[PDB]
Design a binder for this molecule. Structure first.
Ligand SMILES: CCCCCCCCCCCCCCCCCC(=O)OC[C@H](COP(=O)([O-])OCC(O)COP(=O)([O-])OC[C@@H](COC(=O)CCCCCCCCCCCCCCCCC)OC(=O)CCCCCCCCCCCCCCCCC)OC(=O)CCCCCCCCCCCCCCCCC
Ligand SMILES: CCCCCCCCCCCCCCCCCC(=O)OC[C@H](COP(=O)([O-])OCC(O)COP(=O)([O-])OC[C@@H](COC(=O)CCCCCCCCCCCCCCCCC)OC(=O)CCCCCCCCCCCCCCCCC)OC(=O)CCCCCCCCCCCCCCCCC
Ligand SMILES: CCCCCCCCCCCCCCCCCC(=O)OC[C@H](COP(=O)([O-])OCC(O)COP(=O)([O-])OC[C@@H](COC(=O)CCCCCCCCCCCCCCCCC)OC(=O)CCCCCCCCCCCCCCCCC)OC(=O)CCCCCCCCCCCCCCCCC
Ligand SMILES: CCCCCCCCCCCCCCCCC[C@@H](O)O[C@H](CO[C@H](O)CCCCCCCCCCCCCCC)COP(=O)(O)OCC[N+](C)(C)C
Ligand SMILES: CCCCCCCC/C=C\CCCCCCCC(=O)OC[C@H](COP(=O)(O)OCCN)OC(=O)CCCCCCC/C=C\CCCCCCCC
Ligand SMILES: CCCCCCCC/C=C\CCCCCCCC(=O)OC[C@H](COP(=O)(O)OCCN)OC(=O)CCCCCCC/C=C\CCCCCCCC
Ligand code: HEC
Ligand code: HEM
Ligand code: HEM
Ligand code: HEM
Lengths: 49, 106, 62, 49, 378, 49, 81, 51, 144, 54, 54, 51
């Protein structure tokens, strides 16, 4: 019935107009994905390329 | 048929007259009227000097509109200044059309 | 009295339209490379350490 | 009449170089034209890129 | 004896472009019309390169777009230029129609009507094209829109199934929509040629509303660079919408696969349709909502009949101008209401906004026009 | 005269101690004023090369 | 049949002009341009803005009313019990 | 065909040849730049966007 | 998907390839989803397989709390705080959902500079072509 | 043209699009065709000009 | 359906499961050959009657 | 709009009435045949190849 709580805005590193993703966080985050996530979740459209 | 309230009508007509922007461009009231075929024939019947004054004031208006400027305040058309030149002719033309139509429906 | 640099730029080039097109294309020939490395140097300048091309050193070439 | 007409002053709009009624325009003309042709020439470069 | 006057192709180009007289005092608003002419090209060219990878099967329509946005080189820019490009197309379109409504350009009734038909064509094109991506909002929007056809009293469901190609929305419907979406824009182009055809034997209108025969000027020297600047600003705003904030005019959920089973919450159609959608939300009856919907766009045809003032442009008639901006504010109201879930505050404001939307231009405008007539003593 | 353009015309050079005026002078039918120009300038261009 | 020679008759309206090269692209901008844009905007104000302000009012009131009914709904359960 | 031969035609072609050098240079340099030909472009003092 | 539901109390784990762009608020929704796990408020209860995450629209997500401190050890050797982990996850998902992000920002930078250069020039050209009309005078001279 | 090292699905899609688009160009060029035709008039089998009996 | 796998099966779908589809496919495929008959004859008369002077 | 009503316009509309009903019959029967409308076609004496 009651609507879900609205998420807070965060100061993400890449939120800026010229800001870009930090690739190390992508690396470590993929390292999290490889087993903590991949045990049940999938990514149909992403390859090892 | 109101008296002093009619003077009030003259007042609101004057204010609305200043609300319309053609005074800013020097135009007479009759320049602004939409030119359908009745108005076309009405303009065709105009005396040459008057027709020339009309065409020139229209060019002055379009030229001011070009550069998005405004006619100087001293030169603005005044509410009492106007001469309603096109009315008699346009009324003759429209009355002739109404006559031809009333004949045509019979 | 002395010719303006714009004039020396003019009569030597602009008066004939084909030379004008020619200097236009050569100007594009330099401007492409200049604008390229310039804007890339800027975009590199905003986020040093974020882009992987400079992150390569932690793991590259054995 | 055929002589009564005269051109209204345009000095307010004129380029600064040619404002006086003394110096010859024949030398300045290459500069005046050269500036604008330089402008169009840069713009063509941008559009081409 | 210039060659333009000799060769027939150079003759027609000498007419439509290089030499035809235009009022000198034409402003920035008329430029939008030409911009529409530009947008269509983009929507073709860009779109033409999306059709080379897109697969209109229901089982692969989504993955193919993933193939475009990812696997294809420079595919994502084409994707976003296309999607945002439709939005810019309808923005220039709305501004164009507003321009035609404001300056009394509707008096060219044939051109007006061709504009209306072309409007309906662009609407159907945008709809079927939005159905193509085959996301959640795409599939659901198709089901909801299609059912409206079911509204028609006798033929109804047979006709609706005739659109679906089946009981329910599925792959054949997607393929059909891909075909019509492919074919319609060129018909929109031929209509546009008719549009300019009717337009040019009278000439373009000017903001003052007075005839400009005294001050006609060739199109090539001036309006080509004026429209070059307008096209440049158009590409500027479009590229800024695409390369910085691609998503905000769009709607998340489309990136999810369509589920015939599961049903998405907010279920909001893409923004240019929203106001019309509110009208469906406004009338409790089905067929009544459908007729109110068709009236929402047809209503434009009745405007010349409803004209009462002895002048064209609103600029000399401030009261009607105020009604006009009331109308624009009202359209903003509906357009905002279309983004919202039904609740007490919204339903009441939507109904009042719709009724006001009909009454302001079927009643108030002609009457205040007559008042403006009496105030000026003729 | 070919499709019957200019009615009558002449070329002139009214030189003065300080400047001068090269040019052309022609009568026109209302409908031909453009065409009569297109030839004239072309002739100048034809002499420019 | 609406070529420039075919257009409207008009008589002794003399017009003056200048070559683009003879005059600068931005005359009197600071002195004449900005005040002109200002008188234009000043003419535009009351005819345009306030109705949009009314849109802002109906917008904020509708948002506050929906948000009010929604979160006071449990509060409506509170006064209920 | 045969009529085009003639001394004034020779004078005219000689008058228009340099313009042909110019437009030929325009088309040649323009063609190379557009396709970014590696073989012709490298020879240049500064344009080395290709690796 | 059927086996996935059977393995997960009927719930189907969503594909993560578009999970950032799919949900409202983007990656911002995901981090907040991975963080909040307050124990349920008094006066409400739920199925034993369900877990109370307020940010989830159903407010009773079937997902078990995926992460906590030292679930994992980064090869980088940085500490495995659950906040750091969730941040890295949302970042990697953000990339998985928008691979073209960097190149897009680059072109965007190039285009702004490009348009910033082009606009004054073309507008100046328009001022140039139109100046003869903007400056032109006209007068009216009746014969008498 | 192939979109790859051999004929395959992307090529088939290429040809589906181009084959879908060309005829509509052919119609416009046909309009140009008639446009260059009608300003002179249709030819007759004798080859003699036939203005006398149009 | 323009894919390397589904195209041929879609053709069988047109020839069979689709109503009156085979008539469409054959009026189309033979209509092209008719288009070239009419086209070759159309060029041939131009080669014959000297319509090429246009 | 008021002008269209009148003493001769009544006569004219009356002159075109038979044509109006006749073309109305044209549109009606033409619609019934183009659509294979079943309802009226069940009633027609011979056109009953429909089952
Ligand atoms: C959806 C959003 C679309 C926005 C319009 C995009 C295209 C506008 C256009 O026609 O080309 C530029 C066009 C150039 O002037 P123009 O060719 O003479 O147009 C005819 C005038 O409308 C003729 O009318 P005017 O001469 O009386 O002047 C109208 C205009 C006067 O504006 C101008 O004189 C031209 C622009 C100069 C101001 C620039 C400000 C800084 C940027 O007055 C206004 O600004 C509108 C009043 C409310 C906004 C006030 C502040 C906005 C600036 O400027 C405008 O039309 C006004 C733009 C309004 C901005 C949006 C305000 C939000 C509402
Ligand atoms: C795409 C196709 C590109 C080629 C267009 C071919 C059509 C042009 C044409 O029929 O010229 C009539 C011209 C005959 O009229 P005319 O007495 O010689 O006077 C020429 C002017 O059109 C006499 O009229 P005007 O003096 O008023 O000429 C002004 C008018 C002339 O415009 C036209 O003549 C018609 C152009 C649109 C045709 C309607 C499209 C319907 C679909 O210019 C415009 O309407 C503005 C341009 C609109 C077309 C823009 C197309 C690209 C965008 O040429 C013909 O003999 C008609 C046969 C051409 C093919 C027709 C068969 C299939 C349709
Ligand atoms: C380089 C400098 C900035 C270039 C600005 C480029 C923007 C061009 C533009 O959008 O204006 C319309 C411009 C037309 O200019 P215009 O009507 O011939 O100008 C009137 C004449 O200058 C004659 O009218 P005017 O006397 O009003 O001309 C003066 C005005 C030009 O009058 C205008 O129309 C306003 C536009 C330029 C001024 C805006 C200032 C923004 C900065 O320009 C000025 O000198 C105003 C100076 C203000 C300086 C700012 C104060 C602090 C510094 O081009 C267009 O029609 C494009 C509009 C449609 C775009 C499609 C929308 C996409 C969806
Ligand atoms: C999305 C659909 C639309 C397409 C997008 C269009 C985007 C364009 C918007 C930008 C505006 C561009 C207009 C700017 C002006 C153009 C330059 C033009 O004015 O140059 C004129 C003349 O043009 C050049 O001189 C000739 C061409 C030079 C450059 C040629 C480069 C190659 C272009 C070939 C393209 C052909 C198309 C096919 C593709 C190969 C100069 O005339 P002018 O200033 O008054 O007098 C000069 C006197 N001179 C010459 C004696 C000095
Ligand atoms: C759907 C809409 C969804 C869009 C979401 C948000 C859109 C907000 C739109 C608000 C924009 C309005 C700002 C315009 C500023 C303005 O008009 O300034 C006043 C200015 C003064 O003009 P003059 O009379 O010439 O002054 C004389 C001085 N010489 O007025 C104008 O010129 C405006 C006239 C042009 C109309 C353009 C308005 C754009 C919106 C119109 C759309 C409405 C029609 C909708 C019909 C659609 C049916 C399919
Ligand atoms: C085939 C025929 C198609 C003809 C299309 C002609 C369209 C001309 C419109 C030009 C308007 C563009 C204005 C500014 C665009 C711009 O500057 O983009 C440059 C910039 C350079 O990026 P890099 O790849 O990193 O650099 C590599 C070396 N240069 O490119 C971009 O990122 C933007 C791309 C979007 C362009 C879309 C134009 C389509 C309009 C049609
Ligand atoms: C198998 C245990 C499990 C793990 C571990 C897990 N997920 Fe989930 N996740 C689920 C299930 C099941 C759902 C669906 C919840 C529902 O339908 O109510 C879900 C939902 C989500 C959602 C929200 C989807 C929605 O509809 O709101 C996101 C985002 C997500 N997962 C991503 C992640 C991220 C990031 C992690 C961090 C490692 C993660 N998953 C780990 C099982 C898991
Ligand atoms: C006025 C003309 C057109 C408009 C306004 C228009 C608009 C749209 C819109 C709104 C979408 C939805 C995309 C999205 O939201 O992600 C779309 C998609 C698409 N358009 Fe167009 N379109 C037009 C013409 C064309 C043309 C001529 C083609 C020719 C190929 C085309 C091909 C496509 C294709 C294949 C898609 C789906 C592919 C994808 O979305 O990735 N469109 N178009
Ligand atoms: C893709 C869509 C359209 C295109 C390409 C197009 C094209 C054009 C063009 C090129 C002009 C020349 C004048 C100008 O640009 O201002 C014009 C004028 C006009 N258009 Fe459009 N048009 C489109 C849609 C519409 C619509 C939807 C309407 C009406 C609802 C409309 C009504 C008019 C009218 C009345 C004029 C006359 C302008 C005047 O009188 O000054 N057009 N159109
Ligand atoms: C889609 C393809 C074509 C279409 C729609 C088309 C259409 C037409 C039409 C309707 C005519 C009028 C005279 C007539 O019908 O005989 C005509 C004349 C002509 N066409 Fe075609 N044609 C096509 C292809 C061609 C080809 C391939 C050629 C030459 C190789 C050609 C050359 C001519 C010539 C020379 C005439 C002049 C005939 C005359 O003056 O009597 N056309 N075309």
């Amino acid at each position: 019935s009651d609507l879900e709580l609205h998420p807070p805005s965060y100061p993400w590193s890449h939120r800026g107009l010229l800001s870009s993703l930090d690739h190390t966080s992508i690396r470590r985050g993929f390292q999290v994905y490889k087993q903590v996530c991949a045990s049940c979740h999938s990514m149909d459209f992403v390859a090892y390329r | 048929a109101v008296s002093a309230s009619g003077k009030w009508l003259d007042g609101i007509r004057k204010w609305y007259y200043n609300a319309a922007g053609f005074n800013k461009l020097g135009l007479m009231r009759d320049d602004t009227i939409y030119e359908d075929e009745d108005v076309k024939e009405a303009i065709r019947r105009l005396p040459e000097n008057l027709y020339n004054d009309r065409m020139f004031r229209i060019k002055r208006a379009l030229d001011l509109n070009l550069k998005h400027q405004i006619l100087p305040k001293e030169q603005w058309t005044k509410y009492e200044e106007e001469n309603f030149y096109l009315e008699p002719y346009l009324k003759e033309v429209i009355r002739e059309r109404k006559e031809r139509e009333e004949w045509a429906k019979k | 009295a002395a010719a303006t640099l714009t004039s020396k730029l003019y009569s030597l080039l602009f008066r004939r339209t084909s030379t004008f097109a020619l200097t236009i294309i050569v100007g594009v020939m330099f401007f492409e490379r200049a604008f390229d490395q310039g804007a890339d140097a800027i975009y590199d300048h905003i986020n040093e350490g974020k882009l992987w091309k400079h992150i390569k050193h932690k793991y590259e070439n054995k | 009449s055929h002589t009564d007409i005269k051109v209204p002053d345009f000095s307010e709009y004129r380029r600064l170089e040619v404002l006086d009624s003394t110096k010859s325009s024949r030398e300045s003309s290459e500069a005046r034209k050269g500036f604008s042709y330089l402008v169009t020439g840069v713009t063509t470069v941008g559009v081409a890129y | 004896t210039p060659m333009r006057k000799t060769n027939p192709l150079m003759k027609l180009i000498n007419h439509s472009f290089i030499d035809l007289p235009t009022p000198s005092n034409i402003s920035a608003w008329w430029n939008f019309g030409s911009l529409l002419g530009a947008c269509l090209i983009l929507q073709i060219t860009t779109g033409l390169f999306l059709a080379m990878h897109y697969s209109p099967d229901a089982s692969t329509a989504f993955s193919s777009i993933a193939h475009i946005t990812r696997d294809v080189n420079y595919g994502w820019i084409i994707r976003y230029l296309h999607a945002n490009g439709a939005s810019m197309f309808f923005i220039c379109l709305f501004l164009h129609i507003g321009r035609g409504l404001y300056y009394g350009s509707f008096l060219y009734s044939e051109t007006w009507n061709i504009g209306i038909i072309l409007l309906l064509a662009t609407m159907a094109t945008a709809f079927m094209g939005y159905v193509l991506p085959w996301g959640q909002m795409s599939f659901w929007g198709a089901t909801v829109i299609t059912n409206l056809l079911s509204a028609i009293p006798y033929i109804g469901t047979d006709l609706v199934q005739w659109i679906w190609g089946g009981y329910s929305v599925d792959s054949p419907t997607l393929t059909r929509f891909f075909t019509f979406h492919f074919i319609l824009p060129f018909i929109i182009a031929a209509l546009a040629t008719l549009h300019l055809l009717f337009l040019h034997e009278t000439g373009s209108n000017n903001p003052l509303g007075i005839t400009s025969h005294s001050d006609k000027i060739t199109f090539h020297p001036y309006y080509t660079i004026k429209d070059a600047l307008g096209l440049l600003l158009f590409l500027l705003s479009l590229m800024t919408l695409t390369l910085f904030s691609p998503d905000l005019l769009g709607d998340p959920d489309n990136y999810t696969l369509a589920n015939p089973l599961n049903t998405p919450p907010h279920i909001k159609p893409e923004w240019y349709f929203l106001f019309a959608y509110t009208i469906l939300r406004s009338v409790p009856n089905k067929l009544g909502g459908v007729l109110a919907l068709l009236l929402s766009i047809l209503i434009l045809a009745m405007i010349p009949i409803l004209h009462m003032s002895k002048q064209q442009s609103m600029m000399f008639r401030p009261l009607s101008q105020s009604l006009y901006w009331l109308l624009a504010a009202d359209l903003l109201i509906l357009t905002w209401i279309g983004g919202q879930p039904v609740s007490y505050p919204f339903t009441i404001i939507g109904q009042v906004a719709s009724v006001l939307y009909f009454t302001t231009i079927l009643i108030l405008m002609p009457t205040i026009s007559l008042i403006e007539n009496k105030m000026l003593k003729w | 005269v070919a499709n019957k353009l200019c009615q009558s015309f002449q070329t002139f050079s009214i030189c003065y101690a300080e400047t001068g005026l090269l040019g052309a002078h022609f009568v026109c039918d209302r409908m031909k004023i453009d065409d009569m120009m297109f030839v004239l300038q072309g002739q100048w261009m034809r002499l420019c090369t | 049949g609406r070529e420039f020679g075919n257009l409207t008759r008009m008589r002794h309206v003399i017009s003056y002009s200048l070559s683009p090269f003879e005059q600068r692209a931005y005359p009197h901008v600071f002195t004449k341009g900005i005040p002109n844009v200002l008188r234009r905007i000043r003419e535009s104000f009351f005819r345009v803005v306030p109705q949009f302000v009314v849109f802002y009012l109906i917008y904020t009131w509708g948002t506050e009313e929906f948000e009010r009914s929604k979160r006071k709904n449990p509060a409506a359960y509170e006064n209920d019990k | 065909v045969t009529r085009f031969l003639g001394p004034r035609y020779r004078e005219l072609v000689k008058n228009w040849v340099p313009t042909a050098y110019t437009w030929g240079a325009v088309g040649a340099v323009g063609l190379v730049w557009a396709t970014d030909w590696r073989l012709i472009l490298d020879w240049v003092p500064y344009i080395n966007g290709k690796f | 998907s059927e086996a996935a539901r059977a393995a997960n109390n009927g719930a189907l784990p969503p594909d993560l390839s578009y999970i950032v762009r799919a949900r409202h608020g983007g990656e911002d929704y995901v981090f907040s989803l991975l963080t909040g796990y307050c124990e349920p408020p008094t006066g409400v209860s739920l199925r034993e397989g369900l877990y109370f995450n307020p940010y989830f629209p159903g407010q009773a997500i079937a997902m078990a709390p995926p992460i906590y401190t030292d679930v994992l050890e980064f090869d980088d050797g940085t500490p495995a705080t659950m906040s750091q982990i969730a941040k890295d996850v949302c970042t990697f998902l953000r990339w998985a959902s928008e691979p073209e992000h960097d190149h897009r920002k680059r072109m965007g930078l190039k285009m702004l500079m490009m348009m910033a250069l082009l606009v004054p020039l073309v507008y100046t050209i328009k001022r140039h072509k139109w100046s003869v009309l903007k400056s032109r005078k006209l007068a009216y001279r009746p014969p008498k």
